[PDB]
Amino acid sequence: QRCGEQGSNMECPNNLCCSQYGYCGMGGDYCGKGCQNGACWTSKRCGSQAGGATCPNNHCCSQYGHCGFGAEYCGAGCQGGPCRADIKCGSQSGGKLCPNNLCCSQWGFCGLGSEFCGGGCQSGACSTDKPCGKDAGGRVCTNNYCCSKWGSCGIGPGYCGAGCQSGGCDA
Amino acid sequence: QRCGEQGSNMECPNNLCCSQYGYCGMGGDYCGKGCQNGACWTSKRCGSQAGGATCPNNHCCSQYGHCGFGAEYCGAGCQGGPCRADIKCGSQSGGKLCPNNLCCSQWGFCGLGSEFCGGGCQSGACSTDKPCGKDAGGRVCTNNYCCSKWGSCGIGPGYCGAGCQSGGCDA
Ligand SMILES: CC(=O)N[C@H]1[C@H]([C@H](O)[C@H](O)CO)O[C@@](O[C@H]2[C@@H](O)[C@@H](CO)O[C@@H](O[C@H]3[C@H](O)[C@@H](O)[C@H](O)O[C@@H]3CO)[C@@H]2O)(C(=O)O)C[C@@H]1O
Ligand SMILES: CC(=O)N[C@H]1[C@H]([C@H](O)[C@H](O)CO)O[C@@](O[C@H]2[C@@H](O)[C@@H](CO)O[C@@H](O[C@H]3[C@H](O)[C@@H](O)[C@H](O)O[C@@H]3CO)[C@@H]2O)(C(=O)O)C[C@@H]1O
């Protein structure tokens, strides 16, 4: 029920802005000053300009390092987000990871969907669910995903907790 | 702290999937069966194919009406989301509204940022905060935003509740 720092970095649907208090809506109250994510009046900073900073809600990082949508943002020089130019990764880009957990197709492009996440998927939210750890010739997950006691890659208490064999293990 | 139906349609950051239980993570537990939003293994349905259905997390609606990112999705025939082709609206498109509350520039394109939301913004999350209601020659908000007792357009208890003069007023 809450967004931002109070909702553990949860985002409002349909780009509703998250007020300074951690609640979702539209208007000056939510989108003006203190806005956390969503359609904030003062676009957030991102990319190079703001330290490698990614945009929330999948917004595009424009060449000037401001968050938004449209040609000025997803167009020429976009630094991140669903850019208009195919985003490269994988073995064919010296292991680069796609941002925001997007899957890296077999061919070295960042995206989401069966074609990217499906078989051959190199990194990101692959849906191939390949086994990691001891029971897997001790192979490690990508993106620093935790390798659960079960020999599964993921993020969550169940994966990263007790008997987490590798990855961003809390335990 | 919760997502989906349990988090009032709140979305996980960095396309983390929302399990059937309303919690955020990555892996089979969250992204497999019951997945609500985010990088679900089974891309959600959208657009024409799924009743005008929009994609969560700002994903692109591919021509086949499946949710995702990359050329197959934001490319040719995209039906919604941050499509690779400029999205039209406004007076210059018989009042069309941009989807997901994006601002409709002065020129009739959908986007987010100062250039779209800034002065001339026609609909969506305009940041111009123009007055609505009684104190405003009785002008109505766009997107069915509520016109708060104060003469402000927005979405939230404060706008849509008590003394909501127009819009998607709960009161
Ligand atoms: C697509 C995109 O990234 N758009 C931005 C724009 C553009 O970056 C801008 O048009 C650059 O050509 O900037 C927006 O914010 C600007 C606004 O705050 C102005 C007001 O002076 O300043 C711009 O930065 C100034 C900065 O404030 C000064 O400290 C600095 O000395 O000069 C800077 C030069 O840009 C901000 O970028 C805008 O509304 O114009 C926001 C868009 O999202
Ligand atoms: C970019 C995009 O929208 N991609 C989809 C694809 C494409 O729509 C597909 O390649 C169409 O050319 O479809 C994906 O799902 C498909 C998969 O479930 C297969 C398995 O048979 O079925 C496709 O729909 C079948 C449907 O199941 C039958 O009921 C129907 O009689 O024929 C349909 C023909 O498409 C699904 O689209 C895929 O993985 O291929 C998902 C991508 O997101």
**In chain B, how many domains are there?**
4
For residue A146, give the amino acid letter.
C
To the question of whether residue A5 is assigned a binding role by annotation, the answer is: no
- Inspect the interface and report whether the beta carbons of B24 and A156 lie closer than 8 Å: yes
* Ligand 2 within 6 A of CB of A114: yes
Beta-bridge partner residues of A88: A109
Resolution in Å, one decimal place: 2.2
Domain around B170 = 129-171
Domain identity same for B94 and B106? yes
Count of alpha carbons within 13 Å of B109, Cβ hemisphere only?
17
CATH number of the domain to which A59 belongs: 3.30.60.10
Going from the Cα of B65 to the center of ligand 2, the distance in angstroms, rounded, reads 10
For residue B171, give the amino acid letter.
A
Q: List, in order, residues 6 or more apart from A46 with CB less than 8 Å away.
A: A53, A54, A55, A59, A61, A65, A66, A67, A79, A80, A81
Domain identity same for B21 and B53? no
* CA angle (A165, A170, B2) in 5-degree steps: 120
Domain identity same for B140 and B170? yes
Pocket test for ligand 1, best of B115, B117, B126 (most atoms within 8 A of CB): B115
Domain identity same for B8 and B32? yes
Measured between its terminal Cα atoms, the distance across chain A in Å is 28
Count of alpha carbons within 13 Å of A149, Cβ hemisphere only?
8
For residue A154, give the amino acid letter.
G
Q: List, in order, residues 6 or more apart from B153 with CB less than 8 Å away.
A: A26, A27, B129, B130, B132, B141, B142, B145, B146, B147, B159, B167
Domain identity same for A66 and A104? no
